[PDB]
């Protein structure tokens, strides 16, 4: 594997004819309260718009998935809760090694008090808005919506 670029959050490598983008692993937090899911939005230069996501971020040096999940939740929404590991997935294995660890957060409590918009919204509404072409989803946002519909109803 030869490297053509070593950047901040990614390295561009070449493994034969395969173009490979190395990327730090990430975490995402699914949190439901009073029927609303905790989404977040921020301008994403890579896509030119603000998709609907759930609290997510990169795992920092010395951090394990659970600790990163806790930090991301607090820094982006000012909340903390009881976290449970759910599952993980490679965002796009065809070209990048970015792996995302998803957690569920319960018993949320505000521990703290601008570039990231906190968007509490019923998953049913996020889905319909998306179906209407009004809002876009990040993989984390869609996973949160589907997860809710499958195991958090009732």
Ligand X SMILES: Nc1ncnc2c1ncn2[C@@H]1O[C@H](COP(=O)(O)OP(=O)(O)OC[C@H]2O[C@@H](O)[C@H](O)[C@@H]2O)[C@@H](O)[C@H]1O
Chain contacts with ligand X (rule: CB under 6 A)? 8-9, 18-20, 26, 46, 53, 56-58, 92-95, 138
Q: Residue 129 carries which DSSP code?
A: H
Q: Are strands 10-15 and 99-110 parallel, antiparallel or unpaired?
A: unpaired
Report yes or no: 38 and 120 within 8 Å, Cβ to Cβ: yes
Q: Tell me which residue of 65, 102, 66 sits closest to 86, measured CA to CA.
A: 102
Residue number, 60 or 151, with CB nearest to a second copy: 151
**Shortest Cβ distance from residue 154 to ligand X (Å)?**
29
Q: Residue 60 carries which DSSP code?
A: P
C-alpha span between 89 and 142 (Å, rounded): 13
Q: Does 50 bind Mg ion (CB under 5 A)?
A: no
Q: Are strands 18-23 and 36-41 parallel, antiparallel or unpaired?
A: unpaired
Q: Does 57 bind Mg ion (CB under 5 A)?
A: yes
Q: Of 50, 58, 108, 139, which one interacts with Mg ion (CB under 5 A)?
A: 58
Q: Does 60 bind a second copy (CB under 8 A)?
A: no
In order of 53, 89, 143, the CA distances from 25 in angstroms are 17, 10, 17
Residue number, 35 or 57, with CB nearest to Mg ion: 57
DSSP per residue, 68-84? HHHHHHHHHHSEEEEEE
Of residues 75 through 104, those in contact with a second copy by CB under 8 A are 87-100
Residue number, 77 or 138, with CB nearest to ligand X: 138
Which residue has the closest beta carbon to ligand X? 94
Residues that bind Mg ion (CB under 5 A): 57-58
Residues that bind a second copy (CB under 8 A): 4-5, 7-10, 12, 15-21, 23, 26, 44-48, 51, 53, 87-100, 127, 130-131, 136-139, 141-143, 146-147, 149-151
């Amino acid at each position: 594997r030869t490297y053509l670029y070593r950047g901040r959050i990614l390295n561009l490598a070449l493994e034969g004819r395969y173009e490979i983008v190395e990327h730090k692993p990430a975490v995402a937090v699914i949190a439901l309260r009073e029927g609303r899911m905790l989404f977040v939005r921020q301008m994403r230069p890579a896509v030119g718009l603000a998709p609907l996501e759930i609290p997510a971020g990169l795992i920092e040096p010395g951090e394990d998935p659970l600790e990163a999940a806790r930090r991301e939740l607090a820094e982006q929404t000012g909340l903390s809760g009881d976290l449970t590991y759910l599952f993980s997935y490679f965002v796009s294995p065809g070209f990048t090694d970015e792996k995302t660890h998803v957690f569920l957060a319960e018993n949320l409590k505000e521990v703290e008090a601008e570039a990231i918009e906190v968007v509490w919204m019923r998953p049913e509404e996020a889905l319909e808005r998306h179906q209407r072409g009004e809002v876009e989803f990040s993989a984390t946002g869609l996973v949160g919506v589907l997860y809710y519909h499958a195991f958090l109803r009732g």
